[model samples]
Target: TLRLYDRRSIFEAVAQNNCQDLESLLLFLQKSKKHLTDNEFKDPETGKTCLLKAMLNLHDGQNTTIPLLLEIARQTDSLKELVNASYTDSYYKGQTALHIAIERRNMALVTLLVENGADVQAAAHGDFFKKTKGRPGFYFGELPLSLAACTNQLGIVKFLLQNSWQTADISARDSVGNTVLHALVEVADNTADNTKFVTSMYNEILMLGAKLHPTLKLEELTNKKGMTPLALAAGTGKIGVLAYILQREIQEPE
Candidate 1:
C-alpha cells in the first residue's frame, strides 16, 4: 500500500529522484487540502529542507524533478526559503542549495536556483575554520563562482560572471588565494571544445575584472602555491590558455 504523509514523502521523493512519485504525491496532498509548511519535515540526518534534499539528489543533466519542485515552492510561497536553505551538519556545514548544486555540476539547476534569487556570494559555513590534512576546509570561504571555476563548469562560470550584478572579479581568490583565472589556467583540459569554452570564459572574466579592477594583471597574480596564471598554464602545458594569455598581453597592452 502506498502511504501518504503531510508532504514528508515529497522530501523522500526528491531524494530518490522519483518525479512521478513526487507529482502524484503532490496531487494527493492538494486533494486532501493539506497545507504544507516549508519546515514540515527536515531531513532527519542532515536537517535539510525538502528543497535542500532535492538539490542534493537532483540528477546532473536531468530536467524532470527540479522544475516541478520549483513550481511547488512557488505555489506554496516557499521559494525564498528553499532557495536559501542550508545544511545543519558538519559534513556539508554552511553550504546552501547553490553550493550543493554547483558541486553537482548541474548548470541547469544552478541557473534555476540563481534565477529564483539564491545568493551567489554566500560564503560556506565554517569554511574558514574547517581544515583538511594540509589544506583548509575543502571549500572554505569559497563562492559559488569559485567552485564553478575549480570544477571546470564553463557554462555555470559564464552564467555567474555575466549575470551577477557586479559581474565578478577575475582576481577573486578562494581560501587558497587562487583566483578564477588561476583556476581556469590550472584545471581546464586541453581539448578542442574545452579549450574553446575556456577561452570565452577567460575573455568574459578578464573584461569584467578589468571593469572592477582596472589595473588588474592576470599574469602577475599568484596563488598560495605561488603560481601565476601564466606560470600555471605553462607548467600544465595548457597551450591554448598560454597562447591566449600571450596574445592578450600584446594586443590589449595592459
Candidate 2:
C-alpha cells in the first residue's frame, strides 16, 4: 500500500466519522508493526490531526467519535501526544483540540482533554487569530479560557477556572497582551441580550478569578494597546457595559 494512501484513508474514516473503519485501521496498523503516529493522521499542509478533525466534525446532539478515539488512545500510547498536540500551521498555530471542544461547549470533551494533560493555557497566536484593524482577521483573546469567556460559555469558563490540577492560569494574556476581561470588552455591544450577560461575564470572571487567585488584579489589567477594560469599554461604544463596569467600581471602591 502507498504511504499517502494509508494516511488518506485514515483521514477519510475520521472525517466521515466511520468508527468501525477507524478501529479497523488501528488494528491493521498495530498488526503491521506501524503506529498511528507513523501513519501521519495529520494533514501534511495544515497540521490538523484526526483528533482535531474529530472535534471539528460535529454532530448536532453529541460527538460520539471523540470518546471512542479517546478510549482507544488512552489504552495505547498516543493519548498524550494526540490530545496535547497543537496546530503547527502558521494561521492556526498554537490552537488545540481543547480550544475547539470548549468553543463548541462540549464539556465532556473539554474535561477529557483537560484531565489528560492538555495545556489549558495554550494560546492561539497565529496570524489568523490575531485581531487586526486594517488587516482582515479576528481573535478571541488567544487562550482557551479567553475563548470560552468571549463566547459566553459559562460552564466552560467555570470548568477552566477550577480544573483538577489548578493549571488554568486565569491571569494569562494572549499574544496581543489581553486577558479574558479585555476579550469581553471587545465582544460586547450596547444593544442586545448578549450585552446583559456580557457585563455579567466580565464581573463573573473578576469575582471568580479573585476567589481563585486572591492577589491578582483582574479588573486593572490592560491590553497591548494600554487600555484597561474600562478604557476598552468606553472606546467600543458599549454604553450599557460601561455603566455596569462603573457601577461595580463604585460599589467595590477599587
Best by TM-score: 2
Q: Give the per-residue lDDT of model 1 (tens digit) for 113-165.
A: 77887777665645443456675545423667767766667678778867754
**Candidate 2 lDDT over residue span 1-254, tens digit each:** 52233666766676776776667665665566654554266777778877777777776726667777777677677787778778888988888888888777777878878887788878888888876677645568888888898877888888887888546888888878888888887777567787888877877888998787889888788788898888888887888878888898889764
| Poorest stretch of ten by lDDT in candidate 2 | 1-10
> How big is the positional error of residue 243 in model 1, measured in Å on the Cα after superposition?
12
Error of 1 at 37 (Å): 6.6
The residue ranges of model 2 lying beyond 4 angstroms of the native Cα positions read: 1-5, 31-35, 133-138
- The global C-alpha lDDT for each of the candidates, from Candidate 1 onward, is 0.69, 0.77
Candidate 2 residue pairs that clash: none
